[PDB]
């Protein structure tokens, strides 16, 4: 067909009808300019925030964070918690592994004292407690630690494919409530793997499958390199790839530093995105910003930004006017 213009029209229209019956994120162009909702939960790392597209985590949606052990998931999660908490929101933490360390989550900014924690007896119980806790339209963010620990009441006593089904049913029922309250739920998913080929890789089937689909955003978190600090190791450089995102164009990635015992270095994210946005200038060893200097080396800069809270906000701000 010698078509050309009218093509874009029927296409535009097509999209419209699809979006109309399946959702506003059903189809997208990897380049489309991202949408912007009113409420969103910062992840605590400008970098990942503007990789998610909407500048944080979507509300009333099921988010999945998977990856190896010690990649970062929990931290990322606890931050999504501490943030939603700062704005006077209430969070709950369904525990199925018993590996939380308040003292750490405290340093992250989580008001642990008023943090609702539950330690279910069975798998179904976890999801159901999570359900009514969700339906009270009282929770802002709810986090279920470790999918693979939600063992079915059955297995916990007396066949086959029980976890995957338990999840299916749970997610079906729970999916509705969430969207009805704006409560966003984070599912931490371990992988227990990292012995294939020469590096890392993706998968699911633990109870996954269900999640993989119901989930509106799926983050692949993995550890890139163990941050050298002259001494031993301040933290690690985490790399997160959102492979699913029914809210903004998917497949965008981000990297950031997580200091041992400290968590996600906000400052550190400011600098990096800072330079990759022309706002911060790097004059060989030196890190300059709008004229006056910051420091010699990323660390001396982090530090400078970390104690000059007043100027850091200035930088986080502009990057936000420069994209939002
Ligand atoms: N209680 C803690 N004390 C000190 N450092 C911690 C603590 N919890 C996490 N970290 C650091 O945070 C990084 C990983 O975050 P994790 O909470 O282990 O998340 P994952 O989501 O990485 O978790 P498993 O899967 O490793 S619990 C590591 O580089 C740790 O050094």
Curated annotation (Swiss-Prot):
<feature type="binding site">
    <location>
        <begin position="67"/>
        <end position="74"/>
    </location>
    <ligand>
        <name>ATP</name>
    </ligand>
</feature>
<dbReference type="InterPro" id="IPR020584">
    <property type="entry name" value="DNA_recomb/repair_RecA_CS"/>
</dbReference>
<dbReference type="InterPro" id="IPR049261">
    <property type="entry name" value="RecA-like_C"/>
</dbReference>
<dbReference type="InterPro" id="IPR003593">
    <property type="entry name" value="AAA+_ATPase"/>
</dbReference>
<dbReference type="InterPro" id="IPR023400">
    <property type="entry name" value="RecA_C_sf"/>
</dbReference>
<dbReference type="InterPro" id="IPR004860">
    <property type="entry name" value="LAGLIDADG_dom"/>
</dbReference>
<dbReference type="InterPro" id="IPR013765">
    <property type="entry name" value="DNA_recomb/repair_RecA"/>
</dbReference>
<comment type="similarity">
    <text>Belongs to the RecA family.</text>
</comment>
<dbReference type="InterPro" id="IPR049428">
    <property type="entry name" value="RecA-like_N"/>
</dbReference>
<dbReference type="Pfam" id="PF14890">
    <property type="entry name" value="Intein_splicing"/>
</dbReference>
<comment type="function">
    <text>PI-MtuI is an endonuclease.</text>
</comment>
<dbReference type="InterPro" id="IPR006142">
    <property type="entry name" value="INTEIN"/>
</dbReference>
<dbReference type="InterPro" id="IPR036844">
    <property type="entry name" value="Hint_dom_sf"/>
</dbReference>
<dbReference type="InterPro" id="IPR020587">
    <property type="entry name" value="RecA_monomer-monomer_interface"/>
</dbReference>
<dbReference type="Pfam" id="PF00154">
    <property type="entry name" value="RecA"/>
</dbReference>
<dbReference type="InterPro" id="IPR030934">
    <property type="entry name" value="Intein_C"/>
</dbReference>
<dbReference type="Pfam" id="PF21096">
    <property type="entry name" value="RecA_C"/>
</dbReference>
<dbReference type="InterPro" id="IPR003587">
    <property type="entry name" value="Hint_dom_N"/>
</dbReference>
<dbReference type="InterPro" id="IPR027417">
    <property type="entry name" value="P-loop_NTPase"/>
</dbReference>
<comment type="function">
    <text>Can catalyze the hydrolysis of ATP in the presence of single-stranded DNA, the ATP-dependent uptake of single-stranded DNA by duplex DNA, and the ATP-dependent hybridization of homologous single-stranded DNAs. It interacts with LexA causing its activation and leading to its autocatalytic cleavage.</text>
</comment>
<dbReference type="InterPro" id="IPR004042">
    <property type="entry name" value="Intein_endonuc_central"/>
</dbReference>
<dbReference type="Pfam" id="PF14528">
    <property type="entry name" value="LAGLIDADG_3"/>
</dbReference>
<dbReference type="InterPro" id="IPR006141">
    <property type="entry name" value="Intein_N"/>
</dbReference>
<dbReference type="InterPro" id="IPR020588">
    <property type="entry name" value="RecA_ATP-bd"/>
</dbReference>
<protein>
    <recommendedName>
        <fullName>Protein RecA</fullName>
    </recommendedName>
</protein>
<dbReference type="InterPro" id="IPR027434">
    <property type="entry name" value="Homing_endonucl"/>
</dbReference>
<dbReference type="InterPro" id="IPR003586">
    <property type="entry name" value="Hint_dom_C"/>
</dbReference>
């Amino acid at each position: 067909m010698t078509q050309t213009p009218d093509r874009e029209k029927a296409l535009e229209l097509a999209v419209a009808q699809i979006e109309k019956s399946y959702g506003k994120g059903s189809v997208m162009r990897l380049g489309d300019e991202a949408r912007q909702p009113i409420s969103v939960i910062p992840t605590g790392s400008i970098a990942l925030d503007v990789a998610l597209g909407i500048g944080g985590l979507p509300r009333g949606r099921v988010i999945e964070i998977y990856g190896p052990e010690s990649s970062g998931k929990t931290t990322v999660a606890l931050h999504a918690v501490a943030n939603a908490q700062a704005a006077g929101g209430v969070a709950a933490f369904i525990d199925a592994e018993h590996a939380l360390d308040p003292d750490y989550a405290k340093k992250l900014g989580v008001d642990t004292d008023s943090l609702l924690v539950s330690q279910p007896d069975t798998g179904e119980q976890a999801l159901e407690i999570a359900d009514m806790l969700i339906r009270s339209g009282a929770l802002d963010i709810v986090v279920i630690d470790s999918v693979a620990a939600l063992v079915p009441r059955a297995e916990l006593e007396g066949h086959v494919g029980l976890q995957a089904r338990l999840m299916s049913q749970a997610l079906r029922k729970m999916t509705g409530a969430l969207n009805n309250s704006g409560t966003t739920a984070i599912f931490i998913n371990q992988l227990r793997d990292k012995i294939g080929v020469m590096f890392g890789s993706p998968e699911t089937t633990t109870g996954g499958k269900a999640l993989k689909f119901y989930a509106s955003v799926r983050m692949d978190v993995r550890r890139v390199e163990t941050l050298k600090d002259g001494t031993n190791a301040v933290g690690n450089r985490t790399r997160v790839k959102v492979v699913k995102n029914k809210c903004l164009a998917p497949f965008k990635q981000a990297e950031f530093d997580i200091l041992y015992g400290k968590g996600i270095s906000r400052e550190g994210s400011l600098i990096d995105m800072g330079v990759d946005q022309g706002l911060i200038r790097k004059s060989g060893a030196w890190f300059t910003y709008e004229g006056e200097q910051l420091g010699q080396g990323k660390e001396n800069a982090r530090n400078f930004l970390v104690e000059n809270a007043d100027v850091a906000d200035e930088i986080e701000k502009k990057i936000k006017e420069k994209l939002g």
